Design a protein around this ligand. Structure first.
Ligand SMILES: *[C@@H]1O[C@H](CO)[C@@H](O[C@@H]2O[C@H](CO)[C@@H](O[C@H]3O[C@H](CO)[C@@H](O)[C@H](O)[C@@H]3O)[C@H](O)[C@H]2NC(C)=O)[C@H](O)[C@H]1NC(C)=O
Ligand SMILES: *[C@@H]1O[C@H](CO)[C@@H](O)[C@H](O)[C@H]1NC(C)=O
Ligand SMILES: [Ca+2]
Ligand SMILES: [Cu+2]
Ligand SMILES: [Cu+2]
Ligand SMILES: [Cu+2]
Ligand SMILES: [Cu+2]
Length: 536
C-alpha cells in the first residue's frame, strides 16, 4: 500500500515535458601545448522562482544559469572544457562532474567550496567513453539542499564513432533527457526544505526535468531516453504500461549505463534505478499507436528492493500520448552489438570491505563519518591498481547507492539476504554507482587510474551523504612519477581554489572576464598539463 499525499493536489499529466536547453560555450581558447581549442563556458549560480503549482504561490530555487535542471552540456570526446562556475547565490557550492575522471581539484571535493561572490574554473578532460554525465553540487553537509533546490544538470559526452550505430537521435527530438526528482511542496506551493531530515527525504511529487507528472506527445517509433535519478533519496523501479492495462509491464531495451554503452542491448521490462545512476533506454512506441503509455514506478518500496515510502501518486512518473502514425519513417535501429566495453584486467585479490550502515543517527562507512578528518581516508591505492571492493549493506531497514569517484567499475556480484536479485542484465557493462538494496552485498572491480589524487566515495542518498556517509581514498604515486602530480593530488591546492569576482566585471565581460584574461588564465592552466597521463 501507500501513504496519503502531503503536497497539494497537482493537475496530473497536463504540462508538457520540458527539455533543458543546450549550454553553449562563450568562446574557445587555443591550448599552447597542442594547438587544440578548449571550449570555455560561464555558468551563473543564482536564485530564481518557479511557479510549479498553477493556482498556488511559487517555489524558491537556486540553479545553474537560474534554471533547474541546469542547461545540458554537449561535448565531443577529445575537446577539453573549462567551466567557470560563478556563485551569485546565497550559500557555498562545490561542483562535481559526475562520470568524469577529473583531477582531484576539479572534481568537486566537498570542502573545496566556492563562496557567494566568488567563482571557480573547472578544467575537464572529456577523454572517456561517450556517456551521460551530470554535474551537481557537492558542498559539504549542504549537498542535499543544494541539489534539491536545483543545482544539477546533464552533461553529454559524445563520440562520433557511435554515430554509425544509428540509434534514435536528436536532443529533444528522439534523444530525450529524463531527469527524475522527488520532492515535497507546502500548502502554498513552495518547496518543503530537506533541512532537518536525517533519515531520508522521499518526496511525494515525482518530477521529470523539473516538472511534476508531465506528458509528452510521441510518434509511434523508437526513442532514446536518458534516465538519471537526481532525487535526494528516492529510488525507482521504472516500467512502461498502457493505461488500458496499467499493471502489464512493456518490454524495452537498455543500451547504456553510467559509463557508457553496454556491449549488447539488455531486454528489460523493469528498470531499477537509484540515486545518481544513469541508464539509457530505447523504447519502441510503434506497437502502441493511438495509445497512452504511462511511465510508472513499482510500489512496495521498489518491489522490496528499497525501503522508500510510497505515496498516492509516486507510482506515477509521466505519460506518453502516442500518435496514430509517424510523420517521417523511423530509420533508426538498435544494433545487437553496441561496443566493446573496456573492462579492467580482473584480479583475484581479496576485496577491500566497506560496510554502509548507521552509528547512532549518523550514516557511516566502517563506523566513520566524513567530518572525522583524522579517520576518513579509508584506503590508499597505487595508481594503476585494479582492486575489488566489497560493498556491504547488512541492514534491512535502509539502502545505499554507492558512488566511487575517479573510476568506472564492473559489477562482479550481488547477494541479497532476501534472495531478491543478483546482478541485473543492465549492470553488465561499466558503472560508477551501484545500488545496495535491502540486505545486499556487492563486489565491484575497478582500475584506480589514471590520475593520482585524493578522491571521495560515498552513498549517494543525499541525506545519508550529508550526515555523514562519505569517505576518501588516495590514488597514490611515487616521488618520481612526474606529471606535475605535486600540484594535482590535493583537492584543496591553492592554485586551483575559487577566486573573488566583481559582479560588474562579469556583466561587462571585462577585467577577469575579458577575452584576454580568460584566454591567459586558461592557457596558463593548460601548461600544467593536468590530463597528460591519459594520453599515453
Ligand atoms: C596522497 O598520496 C600522495 C602521494 O601520491 C601524497 O603526496 C606525497 O606526500 C609526501 C609526504 O608529504 C611527499 O613526500 C615528500 O614531501 C616533502 C616535500 O619534498 C618532503 O620534505 C618529505 O620529506 C617527503 O619526502 C610527496 O612529495 C607527495 N607526493 C605528491 C605527488 O604530492 C599525499 O600526502 C597523500 N594525501 C593524503 C594522505 O591526504
Ligand atoms: C608542469 O607545470 C609547469 C607549469 O605550468 C609546466 O611548465 C610544465 O611543463 C609542467 N610539466 C609537466 C610534466 O606537466
Ligand atoms: Ca581562498
Ligand atoms: Cu553524483
Ligand atoms: Cu561522482
Ligand atoms: Cu545510504
Ligand atoms: Cu560524490
Amino acid at each position: 500500500e501507500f501513504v496519503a499525499q502531503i503536497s497539494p493536489q497537482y493537475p496530473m499529466f497536463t504540462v508538457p515535458l520540458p527539455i533543458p536547453p543546450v549550454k553553449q560555450p562563450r568562446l574557445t581558447v587555443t591550448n599552447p601545448v597542442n594547438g587544440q581549442e578548449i571550449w570555455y563556458y560561464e555558468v551563473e549560480i543564482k536564485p530564481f522562482t518557479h511557479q510549479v503549482y498553477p493556482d498556488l504561490g511559487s517555489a524558491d530555487l537556486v540553479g545553474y544559469d537560474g534554471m533547474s535542471p541546469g542547461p545540458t552540456f554537449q561535448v565531443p570526446r577529445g575537446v577539453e572544457t573549462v567551466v567557470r562556475f560563478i556563485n551569485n547565490a546565497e550559500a557555498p557550492n562545490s561542483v562535481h562532474l559526475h562520470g568524469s575522471f577529473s583531477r582531484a581539484a576539479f572534481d568537486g571535493w566537498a570542502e573545496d567550496i566556492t563562496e557567494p561572490g566568488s567563482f571557480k574554473d573547472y578544467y575537464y578532460p572529456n577523454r572517456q567513453s561517450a556517456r551521460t554525465l551530470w554535474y551537481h553540487d557537492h558542498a559539504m553537509h549542504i549537498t542535499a539542499e543544494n541539489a534539491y533546490r536545483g543545482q544539477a544538470g546533464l552533461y553529454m559526452l559524445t563520440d562520433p564513432a557511435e554515430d554509425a550505430l544509428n540509434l534514435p537521435s536528436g536532443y529533444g527530438e528522439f534523444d530525450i533527457p529524463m531527469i527524475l526528482t522527488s520532492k515535497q511542496y507546502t500548502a502554498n506551493g513552495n518547496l518543503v526544505t530537506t533541512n532537518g531530515e536525517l533519515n531520508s527525504f522521499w518526496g511525494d511529487v515525482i518530477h521529470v526535468n523539473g516538472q511534476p507528472w508531465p506528458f509528452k506527445n510521441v510518434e509511434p517509433r523508437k526513442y532514446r531516453f536518458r534516465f538519471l535519478d537526481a532525487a535526494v533519496s528516492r529510488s525507482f523501479g521504472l516500467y512502461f504500461a498502457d493505461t488500458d492495462a496499467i499493471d502489464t509491464r512493456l518490454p524495452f531495451k537498455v543500451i547504456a549505463s553510467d559509463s557508457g554503452l553496454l556491449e549488447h542491448p539488455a531486454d528489460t521490462s523493469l528498470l531499477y534505478i537509484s540515486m545518481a545512476e544513469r541508464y539509457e533506454v530505447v523504447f519502441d512506441f510503434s506497437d502502441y499507436a493511438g495509445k497512452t503509455i504511462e511511465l510508472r514506478n513499482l510500489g512496495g518500496s521498489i518491489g522490496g528492493i528499497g525501503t522508500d515510502t510510497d505515496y498516492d501518486n509516486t507510482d506515477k512518473v509521466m505519460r506518453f500520448v502516442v500518435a496514430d502514425d509517424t510523420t517521417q519513417p523511423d530509420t533508426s535501429v538498435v544494433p545487437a552489438n553496441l561496443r566493446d566495453v573496456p573492462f579492467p584486467s580482473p584480479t583475484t585479490n581479496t576485496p577491500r570491505q566497506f560496510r554502509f550502515g548507521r552509528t547512532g543517527p549518523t550514516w557511516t562507512i566502517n563506523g566513520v563519518a566524513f567530518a572525522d578528518v583524522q579517520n576518513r581516508l579509508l584506503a590508499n591505492v597505487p595508481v594503476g591498481t585494479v582492486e575489488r571492493w566489497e560493498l556491504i549493506n547488512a541492514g534491512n531497514g535502509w539502502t545505499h547507492p554507492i558512488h566511487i569517484h575517479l573510476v568506472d567499475f564492473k559489477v562482479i556480484s550481488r547477494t541479497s539476504g532476501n534472495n531478491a536479485r543478483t546482478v541485473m542484465p543492465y549492470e553488465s557493462g561499466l558503472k560508477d554507482v551501484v545500488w545496495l538494496g535491502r540486505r545486499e552485498t556487492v563486489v565491484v572491480e575497478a582500475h584506480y587510474a589514471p590520475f593520482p589524487g585524493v578522491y571521495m566515495f560515498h552513498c549517494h542518498n543525499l541525506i545519508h551523504e550529508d550526515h555523514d556517509q562519505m569517505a576518501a581514498f588516495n590514488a597514490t604515486v611515487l616521488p618520481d612519477y612526474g606529471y606535475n602530480a605535486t600540484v594535482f593530488v590535493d583537492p584543496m591546492e591553492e592554485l586551483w581554489q575559487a577566486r573573488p569576482y566583481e559582479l560588474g566585471e562579469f556583466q561587462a565581460q571585462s577585467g577577469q572576464f575579458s577575452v584576454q584574461a580568460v584566454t591567459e588564465r586558461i592557457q596558463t592552466m593548460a601548461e600544467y598539463r593536468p590530463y597528460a597521463a591519459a594520453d599515453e
